[PDB]
Design a protein around this ligand. Structure first.
Ligand code: A1IXG
Length: 129
């Protein structure tokens, strides 16, 4: 599913991402734009043989099992295909676990380099949430 910006913001709010671990909603919308262009079916393969899955591009080495990644730990205890559904529940629950893992949202390089420190609440303006 390709979300619209405001549609995704509304969904992420419903799933309790607003100020989760202190990160206002715009952070999560910004991250999804630069990670996946709002596409839940996005996949990208990395050099270490892992793959990133879904709207927040969660990686298969540590977080989900995709049946082909060496060193797989499956910390969210999900198959990575669950991260591609039009229902973002699985991506949200796994992201909540990732952001609580010690580094906050710095785990997402695209968020670190293109979102962190910017006017992230601009990502939810015009969406009457
Ligand atoms: C904190 C921690 C936990 C909770 C572990 C393990 C390790 C671990 O310490 P860590 O500092 O990561 O050191 C390791 C490093 C750097 C590598 C490269 C390892 C392993 C470990 C050891 C072995 C290992 C372990 C696993 C699982 C599922 C795999 C696949 C696995 O092989 P793999 O990832 O290729 O090789 O079991 P599990 O995650 O339950 O337990 C064992």
């Amino acid at each position: 599913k390709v979300f619209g910006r405001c549609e995704l913001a509304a969904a992420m709010k419903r799933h309790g991402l607003d100020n989760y671990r202190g990160y206002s909603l715009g952070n999560w919308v910004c991250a999804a734009k630069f990670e996946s262009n709002f596409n839940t079916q996005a996949t990208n393969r990395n050099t270490d043989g892992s793959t990133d899955y879904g709207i927040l591009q969660i990686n298969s080495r540590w977080w989900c099992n995709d049946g082909r990644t060496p060193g797989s730990r499956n910390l969210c205890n999900i198959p990575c295909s669950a991260l591609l559904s039009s229902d973002i529940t699985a991506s949200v629950n796994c992201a909540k676990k990732i952001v609580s893992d010690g580094n906050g949202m710095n785990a997402w390089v695209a968020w670190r380099n293109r979102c962190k420190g910017t006017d992230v609440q601009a990502w939810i303006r015009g969406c009457r949430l």
